[PDB]
Amino acid sequence: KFYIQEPPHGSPNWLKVGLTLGTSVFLWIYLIKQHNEDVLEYKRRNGL
Amino acid sequence: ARQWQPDVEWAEQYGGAVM
């Protein structure tokens, strides 16, 4: 039950939680932006 | 009965220096 020793993971590591969600959002935004570049570049080179 | 599981005799087949 109530632990005789405070667990190492008893409470969230908010510095980590923020970095993890921030990285996910950054990578997703980078990926989406990159994909739009490629689609636009691909049509331009191919006259579309 | 119940399902057989390895006993000590079986387990020592795999405890030697070589097989």
Partner: protein, 459 residues
């Protein structure tokens, strides 16, 4: 085929997210609904197979096998849930997962349009089957049985892999539709003798061929009931299905390459029927019965005539329902007396009347009583083998005599006579057990009314 693959996959989340007391209810209910929708596969045409995409197709050969496969999963669940009752909850869910994953590989195996995709799925069934046998079998010998099952299959499968890749290199394609139009004859050479063997030995081991059958009495006996049901009903038919497809590209070399294997089968069935007369283990007796029946399928596939292909297809379906029912019948006794010895419990018709009716019906279908589809298939194969050579009627006739003797010997020894005095825990048959028996026999007997849907592409 995605309308069957996806819901079959969705059985896995269903089982894992079920309440701890509803895993059997939920999985059984929904595997039956999948079984229902499999009947849409019977939109078959006289000329063209049903070709869904670049990956999957269905024809009158694969369609009945698919319907049998999806029907067996519900039946394997009911058969299993009694002896797994004490099992840990998560281990129960894993057991169901293996059965679901086995179904997924089977329905894709029977419909893969490309032979190398068939090979990968043909081989992928080993993993769940091996885990089921070795993890959830009861005896010490289950470990050895798994090894025999694994290496007998792989010893034949690995040459098949090389042969298929060689065929793709030289023909340019392994798609089965393409192979129907781009096929070229196989001319005699030692090189082609071994191409033929590599294309056929993997499937012969699965049947099994007499001589290469030793893995099956071990595996079909050590497995848990569900493992035996799928091994006998479906997995043996991967060998027959594979042969039926690949023999297209082996002509005319099959003319003389079939002789050693027809001899092994014609004589093999008489040898394995005779073995059943002196078997002391009820499950072992049933297993050796499967070898005898699948010998006819091997001969029918090799002689390669329109009647023998219809007979082979009927036999594979009929044997699947019969052999599965017999294992389930013997399991019900085993769950009462905890022994596979046939002579241990006798006179059971006195103590379990209705269950003795199932024993009779299962026995009659096994000895091919007309007009059961067991007889229809066995008769069509005999008709075509007589034309191949009239003297084969002697071996077919003798096997039919011996098969009746051991089918009724098993019925008489276990059900008739006097009950064993000291066995006093023969509880009345449960509803689950009676329903499980009737779900084999009823569909099997109904198909007699409309046998054309289990006669394959050459009907």
């Amino acid at each position: 085929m995605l309308k069957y693959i996806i819901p079959t996959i969705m059985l896995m989340p269903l089982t894992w997210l079920s309440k701890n007391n509803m895993i059997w209810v939920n999985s059984t209910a929904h595997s039956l609904l999948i079984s229902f929708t499999s009947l849409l596969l019977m939109n078959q045409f006289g000329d063209n197979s049903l070709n869904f995409s670049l990956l999957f197709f269905s024809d009158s050969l694969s369609t009945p096998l698919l319907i049998l496969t999806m029907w067996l999963l519900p039946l394997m669940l009911m058969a299993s849930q009694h002896h797994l009752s004490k099992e840990n909850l998560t281990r129960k869910k894993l057991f169901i997962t293996m059965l679901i994953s086995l179904q997924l590989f089977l329905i894709m195996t029977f419909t893969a349009m490309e032979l190398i995709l068939f090979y990968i799925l043909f081989e992928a069934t080993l993993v769940p089957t091996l885990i089921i046998i070795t993890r959830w079998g009861n005896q010490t010998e289950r470990l050895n049985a798994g090894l025999y099952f694994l290496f007998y299959t792989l010893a034949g499968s690995l040459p098949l892999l090389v042969a298929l890749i060689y065929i793709q290199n030289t023909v340019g394609s392994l798609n089965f539709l393409m192979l129907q139009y781009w096929v070229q004859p196989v001319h005699n050479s030692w090189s082609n003798v071994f191409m033929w063997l590599a294309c056929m030995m993997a499937f012969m081991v699965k049947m099994p061929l007499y001589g290469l059958h030793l893995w099956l009495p071990k595996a079909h006996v050590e497995a848990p009931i569900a493992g035996s049901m799928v091994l006998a009903a479906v997995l043996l038919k991967l060998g027959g299905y594979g042969m039926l497809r690949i023999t297209l590209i082996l002509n005319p070399m099959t003319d003389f390459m079939a002789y050693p294997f027809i001899m092994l089968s014609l004589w093999g069935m008489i040898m394995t029927s005779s073995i059943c007369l002196r078997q002391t283990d009820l499950k072992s007796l049933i297993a050796y019965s499967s070898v005898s029946h699948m010998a006819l399928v091997i001969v029918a596939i090799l002689i390669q005539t329109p009647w023998s292909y219809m007979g082979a297809t009927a036999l594979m379906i009929a044997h699947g329902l019969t052999s599965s029912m017999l294992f389930c019948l013997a399991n019900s006794n085993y769950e009462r007396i905890h022994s596979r010895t046939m002579i241990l419990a006798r006179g059971l018709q006195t103590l379990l009347p209705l269950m003795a009716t199932w024993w009779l019906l299962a026995s009659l279908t096994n000895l091919a009583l007309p007009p059961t589809i067991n007889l229809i298939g066995e008769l069509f194969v005999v008709m075509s083998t007589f034309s191949w050579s009239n003297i084969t009627i002697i071996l077919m006739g003798v096997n039919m005599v011996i098969t009746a003797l051991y089918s009724l010997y098993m019925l008489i020894m276990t059900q008739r006579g006097k009950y064993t005095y000291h066995i006093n825990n023969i509880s009345p048959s449960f509803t689950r057990e009676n329903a499980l028996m009737s779900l084999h026999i009823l569909p099997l007997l109904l198909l007699t009314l409309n046998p054309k849907i289990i006669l394959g592409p050459l009907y």
